[PDB]
Amino acid sequence: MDVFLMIRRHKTTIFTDAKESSTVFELKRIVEGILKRPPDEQRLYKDDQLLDDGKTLGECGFTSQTARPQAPATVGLAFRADDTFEALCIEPFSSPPELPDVMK
Amino acid sequence: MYVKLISSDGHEFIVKREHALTSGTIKAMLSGPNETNEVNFREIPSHVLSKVCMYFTYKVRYTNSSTEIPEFPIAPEIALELLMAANFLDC
Amino acid sequence: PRPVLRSVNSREPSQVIFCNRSPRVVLPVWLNFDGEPQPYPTLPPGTGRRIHSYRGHLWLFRDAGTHDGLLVNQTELFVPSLNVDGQPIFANITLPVYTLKERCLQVVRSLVKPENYRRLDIVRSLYEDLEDHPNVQKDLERLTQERIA
Numbered sequence A: 001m002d003v004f005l006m007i008r009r010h011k012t013t014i015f016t017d018a019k020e021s022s023t024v025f026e027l028k029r030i031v032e033g034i035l036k037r038p039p040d041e042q043r044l045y046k047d048d049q050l051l052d053d054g055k056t057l058g059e060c061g062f063t064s065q066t067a068r069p070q071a072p073a074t075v076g077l078a079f080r081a082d083d084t085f086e087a088l089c090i091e092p093f094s095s096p097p098e099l100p101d102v103m104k
Numbered sequence B: 001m002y003v004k005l006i007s008s009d010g011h012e013f014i015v016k017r018e019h020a021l022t023s024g025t026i027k028a029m030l031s032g033p034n035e036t037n038e039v040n041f042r043e044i045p046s047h048v049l050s051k052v053c054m055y056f057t058y059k060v061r062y063t064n065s066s067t068e069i070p071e072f073p074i075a076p077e078i079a080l081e082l083l084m085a086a087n088f089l090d091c
Numbered sequence C: 001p002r003p004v005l006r007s008v009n010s011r012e013p014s015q016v017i018f019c020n021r022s023p024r025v026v027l028p029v030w031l032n033f034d035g036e037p038q039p040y041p042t043l044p045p046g047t048g049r050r051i052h053s054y055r056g057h058l059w060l061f062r063d064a065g066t067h068d069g070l071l072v073n074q075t076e077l078f079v080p081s082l083n084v085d086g087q088p089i090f091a092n093i094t095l096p097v098y099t100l101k102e103r104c105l106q107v108v109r110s111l112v113k114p115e116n117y118r119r120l121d122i123v124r125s126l127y128e129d130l131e132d133h134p135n136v137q138k139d140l141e142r143l144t145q146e147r148i149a
Ligand SMILES: CC(=O)NCc1cc(-c2cn3c(n2)CCC3)ccc1OCCOCCOCCC(=O)N[C@H](C(=O)N1C[C@H](O)C[C@H]1C(=O)NCc1ccc(-c2scnc2C)cc1)C(C)(C)C
Pocket: C009, C010, C011, C018, C028, C030, C040, C041, C042, C043, C049, C051, C052, C053, C054, C057
């Protein structure tokens, strides 16, 4: 029941897998190991939807079919740092150039 | 365990070392002249390097598997830049 | 004189099911008794057909449009054996895990006429790579040299 994710914040992106049976809290611990900030200092989002820690990834809508190796599902991430949490801000990737005429 | 791959436009992709070591070029860049866990790609923009990281996940998952293998999708708009990247990374 | 990769002319029937477990239109290719590749009717994605074949006959499978290589039971070649019970031999045809480079070539080849390869703004060596289309006869030579070692 493996699920493939892109955890994104600002211009940072983490590629990682996880179980459907694994929880949002267990995902925060994985983020902690990488980005060195504890679970209480991070929020996880699903298109601007605050995910509950106790809920499973499957319950949040991160199914295997929806979150594939070739097309991972996005998880928003926002940190506290100052006092309150910062607003979610996923910086989009660069735009491709115009398709060459020969490829049209 | 993990490494950081940085695009030309400043996007940071954090990926399992094992996955990134799919690329022989990346292996050499990590070893360096003094090793490092970060690599900068001065000619690979974010929309390309993101696709490359997705391919690493794909390759590692579906190699040596009985389960049916889906296509690796490539939009026409990205194909040419991705080919250039793939040529350089040798994966 | 006598190619290593050839069908043997046994006259021992073998019922086979070609099962297309790929998103490609599949071309079945039969190697005749002199090891020459012989095309057969194509299989659309999501389809399978029960086929009359023989023991010791050699098959491989390609994308019908592009001649990209496909796997059959996780290998390149397929050889029907004797039907145990009344069971047909399954030949499950699947995508390989293409390198990223090869997969990019496949997509570029599909969008660009061969005559316009040289109009693309890329290094000369990538032109040569594009022009080196997946070839049945070349893959046989490769498999033949590997067979000895
Ligand atoms: C063609 C011809 O006439 N040549 C024969 C011949 C000539 C001479 C000769 C010399 N000189 C001359 N003539 C003139 C002067 C000098 C000498 C010998 C000679 O014969 C060679 C000896 O071979 C005997 C072979 O015995 C029969 C057993 C055998 O292997 N059958 C083969 C066969 O049936 N096959 C081969 C494969 O296993 C498959 C099967 C097939 O094609 N049919 C089923 C089929 C249909 C559809 C699908 C699909 S694929 C997706 N969808 C569908 C529906 C798949 C399979 C073939 C018919 C292709 C040979």
